[PDB]
Amino acid sequence: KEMPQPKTFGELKNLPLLNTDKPVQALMKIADELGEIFKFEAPGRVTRYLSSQRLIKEACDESRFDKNLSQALKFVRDFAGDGLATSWTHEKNWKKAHNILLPSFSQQAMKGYHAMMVDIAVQLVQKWERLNADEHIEVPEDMTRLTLDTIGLCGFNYRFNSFYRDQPHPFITSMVRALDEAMNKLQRDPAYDENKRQFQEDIKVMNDLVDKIIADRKASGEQSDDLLTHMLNGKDPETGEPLDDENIRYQIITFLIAGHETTSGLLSFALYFLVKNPHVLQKAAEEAARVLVDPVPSYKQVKQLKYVGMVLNEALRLWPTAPAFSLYAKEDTVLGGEYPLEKGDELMVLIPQLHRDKTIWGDDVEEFRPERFENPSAIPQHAFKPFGNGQRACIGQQFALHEATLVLGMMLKHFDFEDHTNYELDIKETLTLKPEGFVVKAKSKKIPL
Amino acid sequence: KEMPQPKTFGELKNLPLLNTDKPVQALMKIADELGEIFKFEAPGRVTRYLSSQRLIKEACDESRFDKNLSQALKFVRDFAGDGLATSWTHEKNWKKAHNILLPSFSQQAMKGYHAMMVDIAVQLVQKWERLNADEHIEVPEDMTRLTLDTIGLCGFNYRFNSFYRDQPHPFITSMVRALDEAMNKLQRAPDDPAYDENKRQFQEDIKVMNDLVDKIIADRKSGEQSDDLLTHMLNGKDPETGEPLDDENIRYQIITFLIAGHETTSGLLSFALYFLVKNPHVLQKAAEEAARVLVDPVPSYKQVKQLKYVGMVLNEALRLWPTAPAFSLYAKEDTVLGGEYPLEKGDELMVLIPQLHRDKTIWGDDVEEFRPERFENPSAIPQHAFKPFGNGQRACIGQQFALHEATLVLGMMLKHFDFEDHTNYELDIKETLTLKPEGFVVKAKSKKIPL
Ligand code: HEM
Ligand code: HEM
Ligand SMILES: O=C(CCCCCn1ccnc1)N[C@@H](Cc1ccccc1)C(=O)O
Ligand SMILES: O=C(CCCCCn1ccnc1)N[C@@H](Cc1ccccc1)C(=O)O
Numbered sequence: 001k002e003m004p005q006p007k008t009f010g011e012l013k014n015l016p017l018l019n020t021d022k023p024v025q026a027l028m029k030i031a032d033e034l035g036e037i038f039k040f041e042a043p044g045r046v047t048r049y050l051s052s053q054r055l056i057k058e059a060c061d062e063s064r065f066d067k068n069l070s071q072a073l074k075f076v077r078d079f080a081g082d083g084l085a086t087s088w089t090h091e092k093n094w095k096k097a098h099n100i101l102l103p104s105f106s107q108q109a110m111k112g113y114h115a116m117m118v119d120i121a122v123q124l125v126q127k128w129e130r131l132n133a134d135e136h137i138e139v140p141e142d143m144t145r146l147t148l149d150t151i152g153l154c155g156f157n158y159r160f161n162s163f164y165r166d167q168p169h170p171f172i173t174s175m176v177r178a179l180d181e182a183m184n185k186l187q188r189d190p191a192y193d194e195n196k197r198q199f200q201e202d203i204k205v206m207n208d209l210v211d212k213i214i215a216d217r218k219a220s221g222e223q224s225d226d227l228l229t230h231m232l233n234g235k236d237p238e239t240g241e242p243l244d245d246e247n248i249r250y251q252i253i254t255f256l257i258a259g260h261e262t263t264s265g266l267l268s269f270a271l272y273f274l275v276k277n278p279h280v281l282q283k284a285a286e287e288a289a290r291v292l293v294d295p296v297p298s299y300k301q302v303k304q305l306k307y308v309g310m311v312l313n314e315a316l317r318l319w320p321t322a323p324a325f326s327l328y329a330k331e332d333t334v335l336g337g338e339y340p341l342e343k344g345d346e347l348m349v350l351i352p353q354l355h356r357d358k359t360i361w362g363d364d365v366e367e368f369r370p371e372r373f374e375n376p377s378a379i380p381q382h383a384f385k386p387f388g389n390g391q392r393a394c395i396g397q398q399f400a401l402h403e404a405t406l407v408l409g410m411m412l413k414h415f416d417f418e419d420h421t422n423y424e425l426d427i428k429e430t431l432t433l434k435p436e437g438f439v440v441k442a443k444s445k446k447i448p449l
Numbered sequence: 450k451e452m453p454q455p456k457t458f459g460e461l462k463n464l465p466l467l468n469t470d471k472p473v474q475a476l477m478k479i480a481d482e483l484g485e486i487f488k489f490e491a492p493g494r495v496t497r498y499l500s501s502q503r504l505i506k507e508a509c510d511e512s513r514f515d516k517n518l519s520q521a522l523k524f525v526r527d528f529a530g531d532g533l534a535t536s537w538t539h540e541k542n543w544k545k546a547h548n549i550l551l552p553s554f555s556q557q558a559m560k561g562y563h564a565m566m567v568d569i570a571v572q573l574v575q576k577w578e579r580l581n582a583d584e585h586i587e588v589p590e591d592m593t594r595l596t597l598d599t600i601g602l603c604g605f606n607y608r609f610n611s612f613y614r615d616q617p618h619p620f621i622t623s624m625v626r627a628l629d630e631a632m633n634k635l636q637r638a639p640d641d642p643a644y645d646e647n648k649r650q651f652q653e654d655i656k657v658m659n660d661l662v663d664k665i666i667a668d669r670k671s672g673e674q675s676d677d678l679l680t681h682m683l684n685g686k687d688p689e690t691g692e693p694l695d696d697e698n699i700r701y702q703i704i705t706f707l708i709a710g711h712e713t714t715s716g717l718l719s720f721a722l723y724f725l726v727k728n729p730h731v732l733q734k735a736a737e738e739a740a741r742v743l744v745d746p747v748p749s750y751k752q753v754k755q756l757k758y759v760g761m762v763l764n765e766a767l768r769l770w771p772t773a774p775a776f777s778l779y780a781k782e783d784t785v786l787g788g789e790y791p792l793e794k795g796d797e798l799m800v801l802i803p804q805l806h807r808d809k810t811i812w813g814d815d816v817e818e819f820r821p822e823r824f825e826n827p828s829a830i831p832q833h834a835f836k837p838f839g840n841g842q843r844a845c846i847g848q849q850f851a852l853h854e855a856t857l858v859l860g861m862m863l864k865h866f867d868f869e870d871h872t873n874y875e876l877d878i879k880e881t882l883t884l885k886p887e888g889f890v891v892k893a894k895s896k897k898i899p900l
Contacts (some may be wrong), residue, residue, distance in 0.1 A: 279828045287832070304512060306834060360557065362754065371827050375844060377551060 001338055003048065004034040005041065009189045013041035016430045020189045022429045023354070024323045031353045037339065040348075045071065047326075047346045048339075051353035051358045055336050056381035059327050059347050060389045068328035068346055068393040072431060075182035076257070081202045082247060083254030084395060092239075093247055098395070100243060101236035101251070104227055107394050112225045113154045114299045120150045121297075121407050122449055123163045125414050128442045136420065139271055139438045140207050143264035148172060150403055151259035156213055156252055171390060174202035175257060179431055210249045227255065255396070261432045263400045265321030266312060268435050270408055273368045274316050275419040275440060280370060281412070284311050288362040288412035295449050297406055310370035312404050316353045316386035318368065321432045325349050325388050416443040450789045452497065453483040454490070462490035468478065468636045471880045474805065478862045480804045481822030486790060489799070496777070496797040497790075500804035501809050504787050506833035509840045509880045510797050512648035513784050515798055516843040517777035521810050521882055525708070528655045531698060533846060541690075542698050547842070549685040549694060550702070553678050554846045559853045561676040562603045563750045569598045571747075571857045571900055572612050574865055578895050584753050585871065588722055592715035597621065600710030605665055605679040620661050623654035628882055632656070662700040673729065678706065708846070714851040716772035716885045717763060721859055722821040724766050726870040727809065731821060732863075735762050739863035746900050748857055756860045761821035764854050767837035768806040773882045776800050776839050797823060802836055865895040 009236070017040075021025055027049060030038060036052040050056050058067050063169040066089050069077065077086040084101065087094040103109065124146045128137060145162035148169075152158045167173070181199050189196070214228065223229055231251065235242045274281040280371040287307045294301065327347040334340050335347075356365040360383045361372065373379070387394035394400070411417075418441040428436040458465040466489075469475050484657040485501035499505050502669060508514050515538050518526065526535035552558060558715050573595045577586060579700070594611035597618075601607045609618045617625070618891065637644065641712060674680055682702060686693045693695040694702070725732040735807070738758045745752070778798040785791050792798075807816040811834045812823065838845035845851070862868075879887035 050822075277828065279826060283828065283832055300512075304510060306510075362556075369828055375841070377842060378555065380552070380555060380557060 001046070001340070003339060004038040005019055006030050006034060006038060008041070010438045012043060015042040015187065016294075023134070024350075024429055024433065025254060025427060027350060031198050031350055035066060037137050037336075038114060042153045045346075046327075047348050048341075049348045051350050051357075053354060053380065053383045055339075056349055056354050056385070058335055059349060060382045060385075062390045064330055064333050065083075065327040065347065066324040066330055070187070070324070070326040070348070071186055072183065073326070075185050076179070077432070078182070078207060079178055080257065081250035083250040085254050085258050086250075089392065092423070093243075096236045096239055097243055097247060099236045099238060099393070100231065101227070101395060103236075104230040105397075107398045107402075110398060111299050112403075114302075114406075116153045116225075116297060117150055117403050117406055118434040120153060121410050122406065123149070125410055126449065127163055128415060129444050130410075131279055131442070133439075135158050136439045137442055140264060140268040140434045140436070143267040143271075144260060146395060146407060147263040147267070147403070148260035151255055151263075151399075152396050154226055154399075155255045155259070156210075156217075157224045157226045158213060172260075175253075176430075178206070179257065179261075183431060198215060206253055207249060210252045211245075214248055214252075216244055223437065228252070259396060260401075261430070262321040265317060265408060265432050265434045266400065266404050267308050268438055269319045269321070270312055270315040270404070270424070271411070271417065271435075271440065272425065272435050274320070274412075275310065275417050275423075280311065281417070282366065284370075285412045288409045290411055290415045297410060302402060302406045302409065305368065305405050308371040308405050308409050308412070309401065310378075312401060312408065313373040313384070314368055314370040317361075317384065318366070318370070319433050320351045320355065320386040320428065320432075322386070322388075322394075323351050323433055325392075349385070349389075354383070354385065357383065375446050414445055414447055416445060417441070418443065452486055452488050452790060454488040455483065457477045457490070460492070462492060464491040464636070470877065471814055472499050472636075472883065473880055474878060476801055477804050480801055486786075494797075497792075497798050498799045498801050500731065502808045502831060502834045503684040503865060504790075505805055505836070506831075507786055507869075508778050508800060509836070511841045514778040514798065515781055516840075517779040519775070519799070521632065521637055522777070524634050525628065525882070527631070527651075528627055528658055529699035529705050529708065530807035532701035534705050534709055535701075538843060542694075545687045545690060546702060547846075548679070549682065550687055550846060553681045553685075554850060556849045556853075559849055560750045560849070563677075563753075563853070563857075565602045566599050566854050566857055569595055569602060569749055570861050572598070575857065575900065577611055577862075577866060577893050580595075580893070583892075585890045585892050587884045588891055589715060589719040589887070592712055592718040592811075594721075595858060596714040596718070596854065597707075600706055600714075600850075602677075603850075604677055604706050604710070605669070606675050606677050607665060612768055619710075620657065620707075622666055623657035624704075625712075625881075626831050627651060627654040627658070628708070632882055641794055658704055659700060662703050663696075665703070666696055666699055670748055674796065677830075681704065681744075708773035709845075709847065711818045712881070712885070713772040713885045714847075714854060715767060716770070716852065718855050718884050719857060719889060720770045720772070721763055721766040721855065721882075721884050722862070722868070723874070723876065724769065725762065725863075725888055726868050726874075726891060728819050729821060732868065735759055735821075735859075736863040736867075739860045743860055743864045748861060751852060752760065753860065756856050757793045759856050759860050759863070761824045761851065763852060764824045764835075764837075765857065767813075768823070768835065769879065770884055770886075771802045771805075771806065771837040772885070773837070773845075773856060774802050774837075774884055776802070776843075800836065800840075805834070805836060808834065818848045819840060865896055867896065868893055 006014055006017060008014060017026060031049060036055055038049055040047045040049055043309050046060040050059055069086065069088065073086055080086040082091060082093040084094060084097055124142060127142065149162045151158050160172065162169065174425050178199060183194060217228055218232060231243050231248045274284060287305055291301055291304045327339045327349065329343055329345045330344050357367055362382060386395040420441045421439055423438050426436045428434045455463055455466060457463060466475065467585045480498065480500040485504055487498055489496050489498055499508055517854040518535065518537065522535055529535040531540055533543065533546050563752050573591060598609050598611045603611045611618065630647055640648065669679055670683060682699050725735060735758050737758060742752055743756050772819050778800065780792045780794055780796045782794050809816055813832055871892045872890055876890050879888045
């Protein structure tokens with residue numbers, strides 16, 4: 001009982017606290033002051049921000065709590081539709097799409113995506129080895145080029161060709177602008193018709209590209225090793241039905257958003273933490289050299305990169321790029337023996353604060369020590385949740401980690417890195433997290449592909 | 450490519466080399482002569498002893514190598530059964546017991562074990578503060594008293610009362626004698642008529658162990674709930690299969706924890722105190738930390754976590770003389786070790802842990818010096834260079850238990866006493882299945898700080 005609450009803004013309750021360009025970080029500073037739980041009030045909504053493993057492992061009880069759509073996820077739904085990430089658990093299309101798409105995302109399904117992932121990974125390596133002396137690397141921009149191109153090629157055999165462009169592909173231009181307007185609608189129509197006309201024009205740009213690609217593949221009949229094939233041929237064992245063409249569009253849009261932007265933040269945060277801790281970079285570089293013995297990494301070689309994975313896990317601990325998820329109480333219940341919640345009450349899991357629970361991780365929560373994950377079974381349950389919870393956890397988790405391990409093992413194998421600007425960490429907030437302005441210099445090790 | 454091999458004894462191959470009372474140390478002298486790898490042959494067995502970080506970091510690749518039961522562990526299994534340490538990874542009872550028992554061994558579970566550990570640690574401090582002038586401390590004997598009573602109290606709320614005894618508890622008499630007979634079966638022959646007294650004694654030794662443990666399980670199964678491992682085993686259920694441990698396996702786990710607890714963890718404290726009195730500057734720094742941290746009459750769980758240098762002291766003692774000195778591995782498929790030693794599926798490897806921890810390419814030239822400052826940054830240490838607790842999912846489950854018990858007890862010892870190596874003790878390491886500094890004695894001068 002007696003739940004804390006931050007300062008109010010008259011009739012707006014706590015909403016202006018999110019009237020800032022780093023609201024997740026602002027919410028972490030509140031959680032540092034107010035503790036394990038605090039109520040957030042806005043006009044028309046009330047939520048509770050959870051920050052401790054003690055409270056979150058109860059919220060992760062799927063028998064008592066189910067996934068809720070946050071205001072951010074509801075606004076994305078205006079173009080992501082009933083895709084996996086923006087649908088309710090009880091909606092017929094979630095379980096339908098979920099069952100069709102799990103065999104395509106398994107760890108054994110990555111053996112087929114591997115060849116296409118190396119296609120994009122080589123493009124990144126070759127861009128950096130074609131730089132001139134004293135030229136630097138814009139890390140998140142090149143990381144976004146690789147993650148967006150990877151899900152496009154593996155998901156529906158489409159080449160955005162991001163490494164041939166300065167300005168992004170027109171699809172990604174509108175997608176980011178739709179995510180931009182969705183995020184701005186949170187802390188927000190007197191003078192918004194321009195904003196809305198731009199919003200609907202960006203949705204039509206996205207829908208047209210995907211709908212032609214689905215129409216092209218069906219008419220051509222060509223079969224590939226991409227998700228688009230599994231969706232046209234896959235049939236849900238429960239209902240016996242396949243996904244209709246509209247849902248397929250929403251899933252591809254979902255994979256393009258939910259894929260690239262969170263997965264490039266992981267690589268950007270990983271490389272940042274590697275150049276800020278030279279001892280960790282050396283251990284990771286030693287493994288990349290010993291394991292990746294061929295000019296072209298194999299699926300089995302990527303799985304042997306244990307320390308690269310621990311580097312990735314510890315980067316996901318300090319700065320998880322999909323930083324929060326929402327839950328609602330399925331019935332009346334009591335949280336932590338002290339916080340009564342009524343049916344339908346909402347919870348928010350502040351993932352970066354969970355990953356700083358000192359009673360779980362010790363006192364050095366802010367230090368980058370990948371050795372925490374040396375034994376993955378030792379970590380308590382529901383203490384480390386960068387990929388959500390339960391059946392509503394990330395379906396592309398094995399995808400994102402295999403790509404990030406392959407690319408990081410390749411960057412560490414082929415290049416020496418220099419934090420030539422002594423970069424000060426500046427985290428940009430969209431729907432995800434990215435280290436803005438992060439640049440490095442790469443000194444090629446002259447190992448051919 | 451061609452693997453070295455030590456001297457042979459005709460039809461016995463290399464086995465008479467282990468017909469010695471310090472076989473791990475003898476194996477270290479071979480590794481100094483033959484280098485990073487050498488073949489050890491015995492009648493019916495062949496293994497390869499790895500000693501360098503370069504080859505061991507590959508042997509720790511669990512996708513290529515899994516834990517093997519060494520000839521020692523096969524003999525221990527005759528009473529440890531399919532307990533955690535003597536069962537194969539593919540055996541159903543390992544994964545089951547592994548999932549049920551992991552939450553009771555976490556760093557967060559030690560907050561509940563802490564009070565009971567302090568119970569035993571205070572008994573040790575008060576024994577030493579009740580000695581008379583010119584009386585000394587038999588160090589490994591008193592450290593074993595503490596580790597055995599700690600695992601008995603925290604594991605199943607049973608008091609061996611080792612600080613009330615001259616002769617050891619009747620349980621360990623067979624327990625310790627069974628390990629001795631198990632170790633002797635190695636450098637022995639197979640079963641002949643002559644070794645019958647050994648065999649009748651062996652089965653009577655197991656019956657002592659099984660009867661004591663099974664009564665404790667039957668006694669508890671009162672309905673009383675405790676904060677001990679036994680409670681978690683009777684009520685815990687594996688999330689995978691949904692099944693709990695049966696009563697046969699449960700005694701095997703208690704027997705395992707009783708073995709795997711006291712003797713390995715008391716050698717660590719014994720070796721720690723040895724290296725501290727042999728390096729007065731390190732002892733002083735560690736004693737200063739104990740003083741500026743342990744400000745209460747009873748150390749807290751958070752205070753033990755703040756004993757950074759004591760932890761570095763313990764790790765450095767585990768580097769020079771790890772008390773579980775070796776473990777066994779087998780190749781899951783045909784593979785090549787270090788690009789020059791092809792291994793077939795099922796071939797065995799041995800990690801000589803004390804030789805690994807002397808790899809000059811990792812630790813420099815002062816490998817033999819006791820410098821706890823090596824462990825100031827765990828990320829600086831190369832991968833798989835430091836393996837006192839095994840490897841992977843088959844690593845030591847009681848790592849946080851043993852280190853919390855040793856850090857609390859060592860921090861309390863450094864706070865309350867000044868120590869004097871009054872005999873200029875010459876290190877004589879006795880070998881059983883573990884390592885202990887035999888005959889190690891010190892004098893303790895109370896600092897007169899009350900509890
Ligand atoms: C490291 C990068 C990524 C992170 C941190 C991440 C994180 C998450 C999280 C936390 C959720 C659950 C959100 C919720 O509670 O509602 C989620 C859902 C999802 N993610 Fe990811 N994700 C990543 C990359 C990807 C990729 C590459 C894909 C595939 C293209 C993907 C596909 C999905 C899908 C389909 C869902 C919805 C699952 C469902 O509705 O049941 N994610 N992700
Ligand atoms: C510093 C003291 C200790 C050392 C040096 C040590 C050493 C080891 C080693 C090397 C292993 C792996 C053996 C293998 O490769 O198969 C191991 C496993 C094990 N240890 Fe310890 N240990 C210590 C303390 C403890 C304590 C206090 C307990 C609990 C009473 C314990 C319980 C176990 C168990 C249950 C296993 C088996 C783990 C498994 O099978 O997955 N150990 N120990
Ligand atoms: O972060 C979220 C929603 C998280 C969406 C992540 C996007 N995703 C989901 C699955 N894969 C990617 N919700 C909070 C915090 C916040 C407020 C304003 C601006 C940014 C973040 C809120 O609604 O208040
Ligand atoms: O003994 C062993 C392994 C014994 C390790 C300690 C047992 N343990 C491990 C964890 N908790 C207890 N490995 C070799 C070398 C050797 C031979 C004879 C005598 C001593 C050592 C072998 O068996 O041949």
